[PDB]
Design a binder for these strands. Sequence first.
DNA 1: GTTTCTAGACGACTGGTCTAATTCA
DNA 2: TGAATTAGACCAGTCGTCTAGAAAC
Lengths: 187, 190, 190, 187
Amino acid sequence: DTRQHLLDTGYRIMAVKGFSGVGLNEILQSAGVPKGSFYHYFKSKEQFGQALLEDYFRVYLADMDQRFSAPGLNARERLMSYWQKWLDNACPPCDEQRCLVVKLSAEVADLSESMRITLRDGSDGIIERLVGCLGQGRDDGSLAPCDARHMASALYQLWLGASLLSKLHRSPGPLETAMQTTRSLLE
Amino acid sequence: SYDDTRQHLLDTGYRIMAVKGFSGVGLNEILQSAGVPKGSFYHYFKSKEQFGQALLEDYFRVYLADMDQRFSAPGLNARERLMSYWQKWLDNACPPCDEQRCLVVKLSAEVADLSESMRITLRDGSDGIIERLVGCLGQGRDDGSLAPCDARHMASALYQLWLGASLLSKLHRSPGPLETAMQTTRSLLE
Amino acid sequence: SYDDTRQHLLDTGYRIMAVKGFSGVGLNEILQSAGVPKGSFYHYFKSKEQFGQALLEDYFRVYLADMDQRFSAPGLNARERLMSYWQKWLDNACPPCDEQRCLVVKLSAEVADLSESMRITLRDGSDGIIERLVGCLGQGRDDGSLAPCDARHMASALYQLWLGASLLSKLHRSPGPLETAMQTTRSLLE
Amino acid sequence: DTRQHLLDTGYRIMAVKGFSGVGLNEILQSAGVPKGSFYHYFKSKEQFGQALLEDYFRVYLADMDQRFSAPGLNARERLMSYWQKWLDNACPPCDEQRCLVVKLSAEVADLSESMRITLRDGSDGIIERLVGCLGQGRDDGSLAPCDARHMASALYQLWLGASLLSKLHRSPGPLETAMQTTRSLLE
DNA sequence: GTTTCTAGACGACTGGTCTAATTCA
DNA sequence: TGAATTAGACCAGTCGTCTAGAAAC
């Protein structure tokens, strides 16, 4: 409820303004919660950051699992559905960024050990799901053989970099480059 | 000597922003570290934003310049020139270097939604990186050192790859993800 | 166990306020340190202020009870009783003790301008101390242990003297000014 | 000037409300100075406190020096004019304290090592001037022999506690008691 | 002429108080 | 169901920093 409302409002604003660039008041005002309530549920802005990041990964990873077990698609189709979504809902009429790994990693990495680790574990979990799907495709013939752990990492790295350049250009341009390199890397 | 101070401010901003970012450093810490009075900031820059722009502009001028020198080393072919760049990237990331070298990695996501001027500086700067890469790629298609490719796509895909690698490398305080980028780079070339 | 919790809050309030004052301590620290939730506070007191008053009243309750004990102690004459009170004040302010014991010294100046009720409690409390001194001085005029004097005047002067000594002792972290007082006390009483 | 206005205003408010019981905003608003100017001159509230106490003692001892050098009075007359002033300006509409040694000592001694020191040195500065006057009277026949350092210390202690009891009673009653004991201790 | 100083919104966080309803009798 | 206990709402308060611009030696 109130805690969850704060987490949501936080995610919504930090996705755009970052961690250091928002103040508790803006989050608070935008959510209609008093400062004393904020500090009833979180001991600090840092601890709040972590919570929002954990909740973010729980939700993100749930979706990845659902996606990589969708009925009626083979593994390749499942894997590509993920990259396509990344490319699709990132045409740049979208300012409110979806991806906290892209938005917060570099800022937060030297600032909060708890947020650094949460981002770190969260990304590893993302990579983990990719490894499974890559593996599933080696079972159903959808995908060529490869070192699934290496491939998932390299692809994920490639798409992360694309998102940076994408934000830098306000173009989905670099993501198209990513998609294309991905098709090339698989098969 | 006015100019000298100003560069020192710019130099200090780089040392510090590389770690704390743009929103996380204040004018006072920068001025203090550089031996400049607090009251003097606007003697050298119009705003913190324009300071940033200046900070970044100098960063790329020096960077693109080293890239040019690097892509002209006597005794190396195009492939050896290209490989030394990516190699440098892996090396000077002995594993927990939180003292970022790379402002493209450190500042892009933060600054892009915040400052239109810095965003463009970052965008044009990074395009400049890719451009020099394309040139080395082409240089290799000419001297046979590197297989053929769509040069603008390969550099763009490779540069994207190391950027994402760098992020994960900061998240892990390990050079592991970069070692991964290196493997993929070799596979994508030759 | 409701009464015990109340008493425990009172005691914890005393230990901490003796050191941090009234305005410098917060409800949360007192409550947390006592194992009572902050939300339960108003189940035990009407306001921070009345907690303060309660705190002080209980302090004087215990304090004046000692004074009564001491000043009726079997086998000591009146001078001996009176001097044992002053001796303990001197003794228990050796400087391993930076935690004030005495609320009249710690709180009077702070609280007097701030809370009419705490002021009153302190006032009535201090008066009771003076009253017992008076009683002991008189007791000595009865049994020959102490010279004749204006007892209400003397008890007041002595108490004022030691109050000021306690202040300077805190400022110096030494029992020095207290030794001074003790000497002036012997001089005045003889 | 701006610095001095801050120092003066702090004195007027801290004399009444103590140290921990005032906030910068009350001092600042009351004085018409912005937070940014305050922190240009003082790095912290604690250091402001120290600054304040130092200026207080500078002024107080300057005054003691003139009063104890008054034309036409001998040492007894000078010494008693000090004790008298203490009593006089504690007619009881005077709840706005003049005296920081009475007001701040117990509060600040456990809280700020620098403010404790300034209070301590300043109190010593007071006692020194009393010792000198007591000494001057042993020279001009105005005052009986005594251990001057012992007596000034006992007198100052006596008036310190009496000042405490006045605040507690809202009466100059306890100060008269001291004045009387003072006369008995001298003579 | 530039650094001293003005400026006050803003930063994260704590203050004391009080209500609504849980939990316990 | 009534009485005991407290989570949580609430926000003006705390001290201190932020970028920015003006004043002034």
